[PDB]
Amino acid sequence: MTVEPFRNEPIETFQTEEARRAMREALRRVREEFGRHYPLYIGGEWVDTKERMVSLNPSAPSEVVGTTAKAGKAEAEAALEAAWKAFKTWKDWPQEDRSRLLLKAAALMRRRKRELEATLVYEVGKNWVEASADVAEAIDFIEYYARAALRYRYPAVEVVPYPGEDNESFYVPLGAGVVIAPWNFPVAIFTGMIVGPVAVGNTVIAKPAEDAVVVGAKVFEIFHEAGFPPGVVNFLPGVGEEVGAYLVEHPRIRFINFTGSLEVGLKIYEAAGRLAPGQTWFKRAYVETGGKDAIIVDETADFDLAAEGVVVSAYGFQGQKCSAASRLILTQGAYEPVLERVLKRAERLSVGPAEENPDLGPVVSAEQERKVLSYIEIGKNEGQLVLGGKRLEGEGYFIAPTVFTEVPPKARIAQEEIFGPVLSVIRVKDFAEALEVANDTPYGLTGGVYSRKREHLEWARREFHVGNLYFNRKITGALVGVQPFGGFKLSGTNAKTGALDYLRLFLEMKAVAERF
Amino acid sequence: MTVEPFRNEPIETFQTEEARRAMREALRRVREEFGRHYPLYIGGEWVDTKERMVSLNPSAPSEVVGTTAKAGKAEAEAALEAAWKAFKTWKDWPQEDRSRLLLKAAALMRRRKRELEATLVYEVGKNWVEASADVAEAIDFIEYYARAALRYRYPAVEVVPYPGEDNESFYVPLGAGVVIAPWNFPVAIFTGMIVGPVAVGNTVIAKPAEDAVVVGAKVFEIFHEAGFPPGVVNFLPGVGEEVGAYLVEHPRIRFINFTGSLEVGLKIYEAAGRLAPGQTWFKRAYVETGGKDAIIVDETADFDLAAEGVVVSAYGFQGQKCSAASRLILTQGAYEPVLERVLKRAERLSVGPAEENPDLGPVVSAEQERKVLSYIEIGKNEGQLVLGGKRLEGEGYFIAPTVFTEVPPKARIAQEEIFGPVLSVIRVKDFAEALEVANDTPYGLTGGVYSRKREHLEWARREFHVGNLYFNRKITGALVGVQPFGGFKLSGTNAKTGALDYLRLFLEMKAVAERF
Numbered sequence A, B: 001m002t003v004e005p006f007r008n009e010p011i012e013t014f015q016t017e018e019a020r021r022a023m024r025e026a027l028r029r030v031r032e033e034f035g036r037h038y039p040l041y042i043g044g045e046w047v048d049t050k051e052r053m054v055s056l057n058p059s060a061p062s063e064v065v066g067t068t069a070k071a072g073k074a075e076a077e078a079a080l081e082a083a084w085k086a087f088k089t090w091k092d093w094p095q096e097d098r099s100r101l102l103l104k105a106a107a108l109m110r111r112r113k114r115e116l117e118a119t120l121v122y123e124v125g126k127n128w129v130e131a132s133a134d135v136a137e138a139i140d141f142i143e144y145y146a147r148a149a150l151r152y153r154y155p156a157v158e159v160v161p162y163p164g165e166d167n168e169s170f171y172v173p174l175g176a177g178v179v180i181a182p183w184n185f186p187v188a189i190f191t192g193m194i195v196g197p198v199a200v201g202n203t204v205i206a207k208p209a210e211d212a213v214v215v216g217a218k219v220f221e222i223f224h225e226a227g228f229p230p231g232v233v234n235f236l237p238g239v240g241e242e243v244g245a246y247l248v249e250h251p252r253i254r255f256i257n258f259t260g261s262l263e264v265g266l267k268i269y270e271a272a273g274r275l276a277p278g279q280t281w282f283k284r285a286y287v288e289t290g291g292k293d294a295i296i297v298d299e300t301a302d303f304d305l306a307a308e309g310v311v312v313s314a315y316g317f318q319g320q321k322c323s324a325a326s327r328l329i330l331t332q333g334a335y336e337p338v339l340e341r342v343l344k345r346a347e348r349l350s351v352g353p354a355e356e357n358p359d360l361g362p363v364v365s366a367e368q369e370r371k372v373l374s375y376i377e378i379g380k381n382e383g384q385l386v387l388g389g390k391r392l393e394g395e396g397y398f399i400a401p402t403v404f405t406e407v408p409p410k411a412r413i414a415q416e417e418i419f420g421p422v423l424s425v426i427r428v429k430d431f432a433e434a435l436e437v438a439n440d441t442p443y444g445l446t447g448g449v450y451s452r453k454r455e456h457l458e459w460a461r462r463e464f465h466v467g468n469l470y471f472n473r474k475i476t477g478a479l480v481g482v483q484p485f486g487g488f489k490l491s492g493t494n495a496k497t498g499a500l501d502y503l504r505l506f507l508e509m510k511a512v513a514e515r516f
């Protein structure tokens, strides 16, 4: 199968009048369909339940964006039987056929871009450009993985020949597994975590994050339309842990793909290590469990370049990114000139309802707002509050961009992932000290360095122990294919998304010899 | 660096006068050294202890083959310290230097071939060809991995460019880990499990199986003379579960490479999924946990060629292989002609002191004899004993080649790994039933099919669910490079040894962007 070489889907900036016009319409149509009900998806049909989940607009939480069915253990078991039955024949599709199905999916997604972006603005409170980047990334995962999957096609493995024999080594998929997706990239990470495993012949039961069930149902409208056979992909919104614990601990669950908090990722990893009664394999678990990411700036840097990238990485999507700059480690001669520039920029940021395209929208939920307001209370005792520190006026969950300065490297707010628009500034002496501080957390996801000294950049390259490292640019927004995404230490298992290596995690190898 | 294309090390058949003479000279050298004491090897030096381990000759267990030091928690902690300090600089060797160290180690091992073979004969009871296959496989792992490592060298990852940026992805080693090696391939698997991780910049602490501590020590003599920096490889003989429990559970052990029984592998994988107090990473555990491997023969087969391969597969090294044919599944047309031919061939096998080059030597230890004889006792209750089934005379742990027939598919002897010279014969109507019966076990390591019907062979390639399938030939003897070796289901985690993909297990990836 021959297609164009992979390119990244361009990210809409809404500067042209046709873009704005297209978006204003998209938003109106999505707002005009608030209250829509989306059932479960199991074995190729939408299955409804007596209980229901409500999804609210974090910009105005009295508004229900939509409701979905709610999955129990029974629904999980049914889905799991539909996934297994599907697998018997889905593993047998020529790779070319599976990859064409992904390409159809991506073209359908692209045709529904504006509607998807609009649903993200309302359901999870992204501004226009964050919602566009999310959707572009989801399209990218499908286009990329459709292509990557063919590099594993029958028989892919390079092996040493032997006289008188044929030795053929090949990859087979694993079986039926479960995906537990995050609310902060509920189009992009939801999509890639499902479509990677499926591309190569696995089948998946997907559990969307509670805050993002409606946008997850819209991705399933795309799968259904694309024409995945019954039970290949299954959609099971539910509340709290019933559904995910049932599948994570289940003997017939083959693998688990998780993106989310460390707390859950640790329980998950430990549970996958156990042989459930009557289980007949060693479960694989791929977990990406967040970060406490830092940007180092030395006194050789472009300070206005730096201040810009820090504000973007600290405050893009209200700091709600596994990849957000939550730490600003400043060397002695960088401290004042960078800090004042970051403060002058950060004080100019608008906060408001996500539909208005503010610099920052709301945090995702009443839970997140409490969690973030509580960390800000803790930071008031650990560092010096110099910007924000407060909830803004409104019923939506608005939080001012917050800066702490003179933060001790070992403070809670310099160790623990806040996931909100909260930056900690840490003063250090020199660039060696900067690296020690950068490396001294339990995490290793993203990290950045602003500097013009080549020797400092190349030193960071070899010693700044993070999976995704960026020099002289923001540390968020890793592009599929360009920057393999995934971390070290308790940022997770280093399962590098948007890379060719990701798909190997979902395949096993068979070696077959025929002596003639 | 440029070396010859990989070839497998020829296995000595001892058909020439020079080779028989070279074997007798090496057997003589080895036994004159039975009085030797071998210390621990920690931080590039031999380190003795007060306690000692004794190694006995399974063919003459009143005869000691050597003694070693005995490590406990404290030498393990010391080796762990030494291994992490080594890693700090060993991770930074150019790959070409690390690969040349391996090639050097391989050349020492090839020059000491007969000595190691002779050590395997006296220490673990291998006949002369089994021993030579084992040493040749160790040399192959050092040669294969030295070359395979370089495919991973800086910057190996294929990524999509982006305008105005350099995007570089590359592999870095994990850290210090522990290898827990088996007694049945105490040169080959021992060497592979250590040098694979080490080739790519990991450091290793090796605990050999108690039954094979003397040949492990001699492999460390090689490591030492080749010049591995202090701390890179460490040798910790121990008794019982002290040393390996300590280290598998340790917060600062990065990965675990394990080959042994399912029982112990299940614990290790459960252990590895736990975050020890103050652990800052998700442990990687690689486990190969045995098999209950079957050869199917249908009525179109070459019946003499089948019976030859079955005997080799079932009785090679007394059946003490994860790859051993321990089930023989015969279709109705094939049952009589194949069973009689196997009985005729198995009845002319010799058993005796391994150094006489019998077809079978002893089982490895008193405890192995117990286990095997105990299964023979269960076997008598479950099917028909029709050859063997008994201990043979001599203090050596000699057991007769044993065959049970009319074994139900789900009988214990058809399900549990016995690891001794015991074959269970299963009668089935046709190939469809034959394949059901082959698949119906907890395991999925090796398998075999004898048949001239292409459709049955090509059906099996697709649906005989074992990681190493062999047609019209033996099912043991997987060659490094040729047949990537590792299993499905409870045969472990499909870590394919002697394969390019093996080294990827000991790496993580970093992605570094510079925006110019």
Ligand SMILES: O=C(O)[C@H]1CCCN1
Pocket: A137, A185, A188, A189, A321, A322, A323, A475, A476, A477, A478, A485
């Ligand atoms: O924010 C980022 O860097 C990428 C990682 C996965 C979601 N988007």
Ligand SMILES: O=C(O)[C@H]1CCCN1
Pocket: B137, B185, B188, B189, B321, B323, B475, B476, B477, B478, B479, B485
């Ligand atoms: O016997 C075999 O099949 C190979 C696997 C590893 C040891 N020798």
Ligand code: NA
Pocket: A055, A056, A057, A058, A065, A123, A124, A210, A211, A212
């Ligand atoms: Na919502």
Ligand code: NA
Pocket: B055, B056, B057, B058, B123, B124, B210, B211, B212
């Ligand atoms: Na011994």
